[PDB]
Amino acid sequence: DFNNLTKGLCTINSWHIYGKDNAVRIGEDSDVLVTREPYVSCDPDECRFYALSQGTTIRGKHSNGTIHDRSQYRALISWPLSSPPTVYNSRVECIGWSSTSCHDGKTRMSICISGPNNNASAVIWYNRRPVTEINTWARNILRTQESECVCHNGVCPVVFTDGSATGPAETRIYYFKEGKILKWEPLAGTAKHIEECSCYGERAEITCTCRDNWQGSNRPVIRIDPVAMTHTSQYICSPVLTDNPRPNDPTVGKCNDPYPGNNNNGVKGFSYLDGVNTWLGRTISIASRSGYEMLKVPNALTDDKSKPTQGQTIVLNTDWSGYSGSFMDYWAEGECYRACFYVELIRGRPKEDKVWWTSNSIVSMCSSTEFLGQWDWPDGAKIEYFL
Amino acid sequence: DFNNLTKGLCTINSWHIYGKDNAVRIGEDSDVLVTREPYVSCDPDECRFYALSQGTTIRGKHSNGTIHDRSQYRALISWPLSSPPTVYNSRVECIGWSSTSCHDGKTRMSICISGPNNNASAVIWYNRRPVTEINTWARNILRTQESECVCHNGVCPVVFTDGSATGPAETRIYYFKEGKILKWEPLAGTAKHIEECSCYGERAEITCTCRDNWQGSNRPVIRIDPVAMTHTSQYICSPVLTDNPRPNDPTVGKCNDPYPGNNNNGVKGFSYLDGVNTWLGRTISIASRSGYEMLKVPNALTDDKSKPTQGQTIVLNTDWSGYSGSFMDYWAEGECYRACFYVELIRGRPKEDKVWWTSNSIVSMCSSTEFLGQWDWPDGAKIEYFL
Amino acid sequence: DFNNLTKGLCTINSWHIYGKDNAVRIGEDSDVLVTREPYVSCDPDECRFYALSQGTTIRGKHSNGTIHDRSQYRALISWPLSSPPTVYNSRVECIGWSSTSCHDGKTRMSICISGPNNNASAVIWYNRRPVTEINTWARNILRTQESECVCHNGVCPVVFTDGSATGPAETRIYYFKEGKILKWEPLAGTAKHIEECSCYGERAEITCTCRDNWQGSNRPVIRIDPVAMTHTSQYICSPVLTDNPRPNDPTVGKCNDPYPGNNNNGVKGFSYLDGVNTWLGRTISIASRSGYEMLKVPNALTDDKSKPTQGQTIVLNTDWSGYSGSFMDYWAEGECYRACFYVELIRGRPKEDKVWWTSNSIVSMCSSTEFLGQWDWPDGAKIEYFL
Amino acid sequence: DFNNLTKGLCTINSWHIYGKDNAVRIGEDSDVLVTREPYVSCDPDECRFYALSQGTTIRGKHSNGTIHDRSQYRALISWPLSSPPTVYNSRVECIGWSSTSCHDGKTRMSICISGPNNNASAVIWYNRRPVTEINTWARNILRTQESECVCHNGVCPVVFTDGSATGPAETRIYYFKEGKILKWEPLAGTAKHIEECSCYGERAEITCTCRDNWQGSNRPVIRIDPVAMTHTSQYICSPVLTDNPRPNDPTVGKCNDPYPGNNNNGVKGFSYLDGVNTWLGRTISIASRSGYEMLKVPNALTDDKSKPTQGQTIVLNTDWSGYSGSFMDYWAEGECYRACFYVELIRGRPKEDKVWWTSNSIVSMCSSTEFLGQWDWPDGAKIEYFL
Ligand SMILES: CC(=O)N[C@H]1[C@H]([C@H](O)[C@H](O)CO)OC(C(=O)O)=C[C@@H]1O
Ligand SMILES: CC(=O)N[C@H]1[C@H]([C@H](O)[C@H](O)CO)OC(C(=O)O)=C[C@@H]1O
Ligand SMILES: CC(=O)N[C@H]1[C@H]([C@H](O)[C@H](O)CO)OC(C(=O)O)=C[C@@H]1O
Ligand SMILES: CC(=O)N[C@H]1[C@H]([C@H](O)[C@H](O)CO)OC(C(=O)O)=C[C@@H]1O
Ligand SMILES: [Ca+2]
Ligand SMILES: [Ca+2]
Ligand SMILES: [Ca+2]
Ligand SMILES: [Ca+2]
């Protein structure tokens, strides 16, 4: 029966290693698929890894050029947790160069987007059959979250942007129930630009932390009520800035406008915004997608003077990172929702020229009420072995 | 319980990408099987891809010569949708160099044909056991559809041709129920030659669009009543000609004879013939198996002056195509049968001499009542990487 | 519930291709396992292929020397029908250099034998757990059938030989029920030597056709009653001789002694002995394991003057063959037991020196009451591609 | 429902080959994973193999350096019995460089440990979800058994050591029920150092035989009562010494102190201590991890003058061995628990310098009340083929 967001978040007093696939290490001598934009998403019975295939293996010739985002040869695949995404084990969800996928308790909705830049469309699959289709409304790269959505009693909202990336676009919040559109609504609130939303839910409410590609170095937040099918947006108030590139941390930050400093750029990220129990991930570097850290900044959302009270490094500054996103196993046993997250560890081009490809690995963590010690989690491939 | 063709076709206002496997791209660096004559066919619970193996991998030595149609080393395999047909994941349906396979609601019938040219025979498997066998009646390459049949309340008819390909042959329409022959009947109507029939059903009626190899550039149609176990044949009236090679589109076409122009040749194709809601696929080229397009030609079947009112390009003229065929997921949720189809994208010999093999990829589409934008769907392998 | 041999054999008016794996063709460019002594055996729900692994892939270095029968690195594996026996898909039944395996309706018994030549022992697995063990009684290569046994209402007898191969040995017929020994009895009748028994059952009776390695060129037959747990042996009377090497067909043959001519040698074979409905497989060559043919010799068992009344070539004389054996899908739908059989197609050493290995492929057939045309079924690998 | 240790051990009158994977042989030409610290562990329905991945294939470049125990790229994997641990077939249990895993009748608990040496922590997974976490208490390489634990009516105790390896450490016995900690207690008894405990249970009692790394050449034993959740420790009295390196067998040995001779070293081992029905495995060499033998030494535990009355060689002195451990299929049919065990056959570095890696194979045996003949079970790879 349909899942219902009835619990709240657990106390995050630290994070533990949940998954890790070592795909590029293993990809050096096995038939692993060139991927990017990963995520993790849970069924009632298993959790799996998800990414967009580039339709080729790493050591295969046709990997030269996989730095490009959109093509006819990409697809959404999922595979068993902590396994490299291989040719013989992956399952294709749908054919597309942007995606999101979530399970509603009853079965799973997966949405892939394809097309030329000016004539793209999305197909909503539900129970591995195509159900519903939607065309560009603004005719400029229709795109979605690049991580799992969240349902509540049958209703799974999904954020789409169609339009410019260096200026105003058109963002809709669609509400689906059984693959069918119930309703949609234009973006609202005070966020000036939305891209790559990273979402979760507890106590009958959904929270996405997205990406202002055009103006903000602080991240905008969409908060959705899946029952009333309404939403609102805002930015994160705290001055611990968390996009990338980003200027240095000020002592005061914006609640309702972009923080200026970098233009027309960023990276996918997430946050868990739960009062004093609020954490933020970011690249350590303000210039590259390098390093990854979590920071506990009580009332980040609303207290525009907040600064960290505790922290944890996931990946060292000398290691490469990339996208990151939220997920939770809503079907886990127990009293509260244990928060999880993933970082994409991109290897290859641009930052590593000697090779002609671009892939990534994954590392996944979930929280602990314990105060566990920390390690760091590099991709661990040796690029010279690919030369 | 046995499936029953009780719905009608949905409104096709465009086509969306359904599947795609990138096998030859991926085949460059994985253990993928050299195949041809693909198709797609649905079970109650999953849809899969189907093709005849050449009993060898692409990069394997024994791929030299896979331009030949019939041998002891071919087989019907199926695999998970949008996966390349690999050595470690394919399932063998039966041993044969021609085939068809369909599910009757209760379980699946798969028919492979083998033998020398003058002493071939077919074995009807049902529930993965062999049940019934049939010998050449005309002792000249017994052959079937090369795509899924259609049942209705237990009764799955299948079209076979035995005889010449450049002249008169003998075509029987067999009716099976549980793998057993109920009845068969010689071809009737006004079609002069039948090969490679592409079939579907709605509202208790079955429609195959086949191939006059010897005379016609317009395609003959067999229409079957699975309840009365009778059939009839005809040609498509419209002058938008759809075999290949074919002469140029006239302004008037034959309802009951072949349109002349090319002799002793053609390609497998399909159509959906549903009044004003009628669509036709064809190669864009009139000379090569190149490009693929869909065209909406209201009353193609019967109105011998009809010309397109809307269209969609699946594969550009500069890309290679090949066979194409119909399928529908009869077990999908909803009110009408959503029409689907596939194009085989042949690579290698003849048209690509530098290599000694012949394989293919797949792209599959299904309809949408939406008016979606279009992309094009090349195989996307780079043949020079195989040199 | 336990299976019961209640039907009789169907009319074999010809044989159809049932399975074929092309393993050595495919083995040239995939991770397939070096095997030998194959067979096919059925569960209630699927039929699979079975062979002894040499613990190495064909293209792998450790394939040099796989001409040897017994070692610590062999195992019984099974895999999905008509798939090459690959490293990633095979299942290990047990660890041993001789075997047999059968399903009793309830679950499956698999028996592997290992050890040094003078201290070997057998372990009876049942439901994938080890249950019962048996030591050499004559301390000279304890060995079993190399193909599936047959049960009836829970009771599966198995023939073992312990002793010399060029002279008298000690052969026991063990009766198992649920992996446990019910009883065993020394060989009886007039057969002078028993090896590699090939068995089937209908109408509550079991028939094995085995191998006199030391004296006979005509094949001895053990007939078992699984209910009374008694047996008897005999030779086949007909002069269509069917071991190999063998002298030429006489006009009269032995019912109760070996036919002389070749000493201390032979090959695994089978027959179906059902009155006028009696068929015999053999190598076409009297010198090599080459070619394979079926011959219909009414009352072969008992009429010592019988000669063929119809025939079918499975493999041409110019192609290599090897072991062969009986199986039937006792759980198939229908009124009679449809007879099946397999031929091992050995490649490599001895007869093909240029390579350092010895493997094989499979071809499987089952009967048809039809009179189907015939093809021939070579392994189809090109040994030069391995050089 | 929860499993309950209600039977006793069967009579071990010898040991039979149970499993064997030939991974390094097969690893020479397939995508097998570099592993070590294997074990075998049973579910209600299947038994599988288990080891820590080094996150790389043997023939892959990133195998250079896999002599190191702890890193970010290790994981616990399991795979189907007697299959090589391959990239496409393994399942990841959890991310860690030390482990144990057991099934409680209802579902399976798997515990992996990761971290830097001075800030490691353990996560207890249960039903493939993370449940409970535990941090270093002594801040010096927190480590567990490296083989399966044992439950009884829901309660699975596990031994952990945190501290020095060449001196006093801190060892806790934790009691889990459903992944949750019920209780834990410091080590007690007269054992001076505990590492790598190898455990089993019958008649409602649990017996681990562990490793005094710092002082003893005789092995300490922890005996646990899972109902009263108490334990005690002791050493094995017999003078048939069974760690490695070890001095030569004295004529009298310690019941309550270490036997002196080698310092700060050893290897994982096991014993079955059941009165006159007591067996001990060890390396044949007293200097290297070479050879493996079983010895029947009645009342080893308690009779400090005991010497072997019967024996069996598993691996010859000229072959390499390594860790070894106990398991039993508690869900097997029958009256008593049949004892099983495994030996890790390490290949590569240190003892084999020509290669830059370190992997292993497995051989598994279980007992027989029979008196079966013996063979020996080398890994069987040829290291020169890797040069
Ligand atoms: C639909 C698509 O191509 N999106 C791409 C997205 C886009 O370029 C940015 O969102 C500005 O609009 O970002 C990136 C990138 O690594 O930054 C890759 C994505 O796949
Ligand atoms: C049984 C068989 O070999 N049929 C072949 C079929 C045949 O040559 C044509 O139908 C004329 O009879 O067409 C082709 C081809 O690509 O055109 C390949 C098919 O496998
Ligand atoms: C146990 C064993 O090794 N048997 C072998 C068997 C034996 O050599 C013959 O039966 C004479 O005794 O025959 C052959 C062979 O291809 O002829 C290989 C078998 O595996
Ligand atoms: C946690 C860890 O690294 N343990 C290692 C363990 C340790 O070095 C010894 O127990 C002394 O403390 O032994 C060995 C070894 O082959 O001997 C490898 C283990 O993985
Ligand atoms: Ca930005
Ligand atoms: Ca034509
Ligand atoms: Ca003989
Ligand atoms: Ca020691």
Q: How many CA atoms lie within 13 A of B182 on its CB side?
A: 16
Q: Which CATH architecture has domain A1-387?
A: 6 Propeller (2.120)
Given a contact cutoff of 8 angstroms between Cβ atoms, the answer to whether A30 and D87 are in contact is yes
Tell me which chain B residue has its CA closest to the CA of residue A33.
B26
Reading the block at residue A98, the tokens are 């942007």
Given a contact cutoff of 8 angstroms between Cβ atoms, the answer to whether D306 and D237 are in contact is yes
Q: How many CA atoms lie within 13 A of B323 on its CB side?
A: 24
Cβ–Cβ below 8 Å for C72 and D333: no
Closest CA to D54 of D37, D73, D28, D72: D73
Residue keyed to tokens 């070749």: C262
Q: What one-letter code names the amino acid at A250?
A: P
DSSP D111: E
How far is residue D215's CA from residue D166's CA, in Å, rounded to a whole number? 8
Q: What one-letter code names the amino acid at C93?
A: E
Closest CA to A307 of A231, A249, A382: A249
Given a contact cutoff of 8 angstroms between Cβ atoms, the answer to whether C295 and C313 are in contact is no
Neighbours of A107 (CB within 10 A): 13
In this structure, which residue's CA is closest to atom 18 in ligand 4?
Answer: D69
What's the gap in Å between C319 CA and the centre of ligand 2?
A: 28
Going from the C-alpha of C22 to that of each of B204, C322, C346, D15, the distances in angstroms are 42, 15, 12, 39
In this structure, which residue's CA is closest to atom 18 in ligand 1?
Answer: A69
How far is residue A157's CA from residue D27's CA, in Å, rounded to a whole number? 48
DSSP, collapsed to helix, strand or coil, labels residue B24 as helix
The answer to whether the CB of D303 is under 6 A from ligand 4 is no
Neighbours of A289 (CB within 10 A): 21
Given a contact cutoff of 8 angstroms between Cβ atoms, the answer to whether A136 and A119 are in contact is yes
Reading the block at residue C280, the tokens are 């015999």
Q: What one-letter code names the amino acid at D315?
A: V
DSSP A206-245: EEEE---SSS-SSPEEEEEETTTTEEEEEE---SS--SSS
Order of strands across the sheet that contains A155-163: A155-163, A169-177, A180-186
Going from the C-alpha of B69 to that of each of B97, B112, B116, B162, B167, the distances in angstroms are 7, 14, 12, 16, 20
DSSP, collapsed to helix, strand or coil, labels residue D205 as strand
Burial label for A266, CB within 10 Å (0-12, 13-18, 19+), is buried
What's the gap in Å between A104 CA and the centre of ligand 2?
A: 47
Please give the angle made by the CA atoms of D198, D203 and D204, to the nearest 5 degrees.
Answer: 75
* CA end-to-end distance (rounded Å), chain B: 52
Q: Which of B39, B126, B200, B323 is catalytic?
A: B323
Tallying the residues shown for chain A, one arrives at 387
Burial label for C172, CB within 10 Å (0-12, 13-18, 19+), is middle
DSSP, collapsed to helix, strand or coil, labels residue A133 as strand
Contacts of D63 (CB under 8 A, 6+ apart): D34, D54, D56, D57, D356, D357, D359
Cβ–Cβ below 8 Å for C17 and B95: yes
How far is residue B196's CA from residue B99's CA, in Å, rounded to a whole number? 10
How far is residue C69's CA from residue C51's CA, in Å, rounded to a whole number? 12
DSSP, collapsed to helix, strand or coil, labels residue D384 as helix
Cβ–Cβ below 8 Å for A26 and D60: yes
How far is residue A20's CA from residue D92's CA, in Å, rounded to a whole number? 10
How far is residue B90's CA from residue B74's CA, in Å, rounded to a whole number? 13
Given a contact cutoff of 8 angstroms between Cβ atoms, the answer to whether A212 and A194 are in contact is yes
Of B370, B373, B377, the CB nearest to A72: B377
Q: What one-letter code names the amino acid at D136?
A: T
Most ligand 3 atoms within 8 A of CB, residue of C117, C142, C143 to mutate: C143
Contacts of A145 (CB under 8 A, 6+ apart): A99, A100, A158, A159, A196, A197, A198, A199, A208
The answer to whether the CB of D213 is under 6 A from ligand 4 is yes
In this structure, which residue's CA is closest to atom 19 in ligand 2?
Answer: B69
Contacts of C120 (CB under 8 A, 6+ apart): C113, C114, C135, C136, C141, C142, D373
Reading the block at residue D36, the tokens are 């070590």
Strand partners, D208: D199, D222
Neighbours of D149 (CB within 10 A): 27
DSSP A95: S
How far is residue D260's CA from residue D279's CA, in Å, rounded to a whole number? 23
- Distance from chain centroid for Cα C59: 27
C-alpha torsion angle, residues C286, C288, C292, C297 (rounded to 10): 20
In this structure, which residue's CA is closest to atom 1 in ligand 1?
Answer: A143
- Distance from chain centroid for Cα A2: 24
C-alpha torsion angle, residues C52, C58, C63, C68 (rounded to 10): 40
* Resolution given for this structure, in angstroms: 2.8
Preceding omega of C350 cis (within 30 degrees of 0): yes
What's the gap in Å between D191 CA and the centre of ligand 8?
A: 12
Q: Which ligand is nearest to the CA of C112?
A: 3
How far is residue D344's CA from residue D362's CA, in Å, rounded to a whole number? 5
Tabulate helix, strand, coil % of chain B (nearest 5): 5, 45, 55
Q: Which ligand 1 atom is the nearest neighbour of the CA of A266?
A: 17
Order of strands across the sheet that contains A279-282: A271-272, A279-282, A290-296, A310-320
How far is residue A377's CA from residue B317's CA, in Å, rounded to a whole number? 48
How far is residue C107's CA from residue C1's CA, in Å, rounded to a whole number? 9
Order of strands across the sheet that contains D271-272: D271-272, D279-282, D290-296, D310-320
Tell me which chain D residue has its CA closest to the CA of residue C113.
D17
Burial label for D287, CB within 10 Å (0-12, 13-18, 19+), is exposed
What's the gap in Å between D211 CA and the centre of ligand 4?
A: 11
Q: What one-letter code names the amino acid at D124?
A: I
D274 is in an annotated binding site: no
Q: Cα-flanking dihedrals φ and ψ of residue A25, to 5°?
A: -55, -60
DSSP B241: -
Q: Which of B31, B43, B69, B303 is catalytic?
A: B69
Preceding omega of D168 cis (within 30 degrees of 0): no
CA-atom Rg of chain A in angstroms: 19
Q: What one-letter code names the amino acid at B191?
A: A
Neighbours of A121 (CB within 10 A): 23
How far is residue B242's CA from residue B271's CA, in Å, rounded to a whole number? 9
Q: Which ligand is nearest to the CA of C196?
A: 3
How far is residue A110's CA from residue A206's CA, in Å, rounded to a whole number? 18
Reading the block at residue A378, the tokens are 């590099």
Most ligand 3 atoms within 8 A of CB, residue of C35, C66, C68, C69 to mutate: C69
Q: What one-letter code names the amino acid at B124?
A: I
Neighbours of D78 (CB within 10 A): 23
Order of strands across the sheet that contains A324-328: A14-20, A358-368, A339-348, A324-328
Contacts of C219 (CB under 8 A, 6+ apart): C209, C210, C211, C212, C235, C236, C242, C243, C269, C271
Cβ–Cβ below 8 Å for C95 and D17: yes
DSSP A143: B
Most distant pair of Cα atoms in chain C: their distance: 56
Closest CA to D190 of D271, D257, D270, D252: D257
Most ligand 4 atoms within 8 A of CB, residue of D53, D69, D264 to mutate: D69
Q: How many CA atoms lie within 13 A of D255 on its CB side?
A: 8
In this structure, which residue's CA is closest to atom 13 in ligand 2?
Answer: B267
Given a contact cutoff of 8 angstroms between Cβ atoms, the answer to whether A146 and A37 are in contact is yes
Neighbours of D315 (CB within 10 A): 22
3-state SS of B323-355 is: CEEEEECCCCCCCCECEEEEEEEEEECCCCCCC
Q: Is D323 a catalytic residue?
A: yes
Neighbours of D168 (CB within 10 A): 11
The answer to whether the CB of A170 is under 6 A from ligand 1 is no
Closest CA to A327 of A139, A100, A105: A100
The answer to whether the CB of B141 is under 6 A from ligand 2 is yes
Given a contact cutoff of 8 angstroms between Cβ atoms, the answer to whether B252 and B305 are in contact is yes
Going from the C-alpha of C5 to that of each of C147, C153, C275, C327, the distances in angstroms are 18, 8, 18, 13
Given a contact cutoff of 8 angstroms between Cβ atoms, the answer to whether B63 and B1 are in contact is no
Cβ–Cβ below 8 Å for D18 and C60: no
Of D20, D30, D372, the CB nearest to C135: D372
Cβ–Cβ below 8 Å for C83 and B61: no
CA-atom Rg of chain B in angstroms: 19
Domain-by-domain residue ranges, chain C?
1-387
Reading the block at residue B41, the tokens are 């066919």
How far is residue B264's CA from residue A280's CA, in Å, rounded to a whole number? 70
Please give the angle made by the CA atoms of D345, D351 and D357, to the nearest 5 degrees.
Answer: 75
Strand partners, C288: none
How far is residue A258's CA from residue A220's CA, in Å, rounded to a whole number? 8
Cβ–Cβ below 8 Å for D374 and C56: no
Given a contact cutoff of 8 angstroms between Cβ atoms, the answer to whether A271 and A281 are in contact is yes
How far is residue B142's CA from residue A204's CA, in Å, rounded to a whole number? 63
DSSP A384: G
Q: What one-letter code names the amino acid at C330?
A: Y
Cβ–Cβ below 8 Å for D73 and A17: no
The answer to whether the CB of A177 is under 6 A from ligand 1 is no
Closest CA to B55 of C234, C138, C363, C150: C363
Reading the block at residue B178, the tokens are 């549980």
Given a contact cutoff of 8 angstroms between Cβ atoms, the answer to whether C236 and C302 are in contact is no
Tallying the residues shown for chain D, one arrives at 387
How far is residue D148's CA from residue D87's CA, in Å, rounded to a whole number? 23
- Distance from chain centroid for Cα C44: 21
How far is residue B84's CA from residue D321's CA, in Å, rounded to a whole number? 41
How far is residue C124's CA from residue C174's CA, in Å, rounded to a whole number? 11
How far is residue D208's CA from residue D220's CA, in Å, rounded to a whole number? 9
Closest CA to B210 of B249, B238, B236: B236
Given a contact cutoff of 8 angstroms between Cβ atoms, the answer to whether B107 and B156 are in contact is no
Tell me which chain A residue has its CA closest to the CA of residue B340.
A130
Going from the C-alpha of C259 to that of each of A40, B113, C238, C266, the distances in angstroms are 71, 42, 10, 13
Most distant pair of Cα atoms in chain B: their distance: 56
Cα dihedral across residues D88, D89, D92, D95: positive or negative: negative
Neighbours of D55 (CB within 10 A): 26
What's the gap in Å between B96 CA and the centre of ligand 2?
A: 14
The experimental method, as deposited, was X-ray
Helix ranges (H only) for A273-383 are: none
3-state SS of chain C is: CCCCCCCCECCCCEEEEEEECCHHHHHCCCCEEEEEEEEEEECCCCEEEEEEEEEEECCCHHHCCCCCCCCCCCEEEEEECCCCCECCCCEEEECCCEEEEEECCCCEEEEEEECCCCCCEEEEEECCEEEEEEECCCCCCCECCCCCCCCECCEEEEEEEEECCCCCEEEEEEEEECCEEEEEEECCCCCCCCCCCEEEEECCEEEEECCCCCCCCCCEEEEEECCCCEEEEEECCCCCCCCCCCCCCCCCCCCCCCCCCCCCCCCCCCEECCCCCCEEEECCCCCCCEEEEEEECCCCCCCCCCCCCEEEEEEEEEEECCCEEEEECCCCCCCCECEEEEEEEEEECCCCCCCCCEEEEEEEEEEECCCCCCCCCCCCCCHHHHC
Closest CA to A30 of B229, C260, D88, D384: D88
Contacts of D353 (CB under 8 A, 6+ apart): none
Given a contact cutoff of 8 angstroms between Cβ atoms, the answer to whether A157 and A110 are in contact is no
What's the gap in Å between B93 CA and the centre of ligand 6?
A: 30
How far is residue B95's CA from residue B110's CA, in Å, rounded to a whole number? 10
Given a contact cutoff of 8 angstroms between Cβ atoms, the answer to whether C199 and C207 are in contact is yes
In this structure, which residue's CA is closest to atom 2 in ligand 1?
Answer: A69
Catalytic center residues of C = 69, 323
Neighbours of A260 (CB within 10 A): 12
Given a contact cutoff of 8 angstroms between Cβ atoms, the answer to whether C162 and C127 are in contact is no
DSSP, collapsed to helix, strand or coil, labels residue B271 as strand
Q: What one-letter code names the amino acid at C318?
A: T
Q: How far is B216 from chain A (nearest CA, A)?
A: 35
Q: Cα-flanking dihedrals φ and ψ of residue A233, to 5°?
A: -125, 165
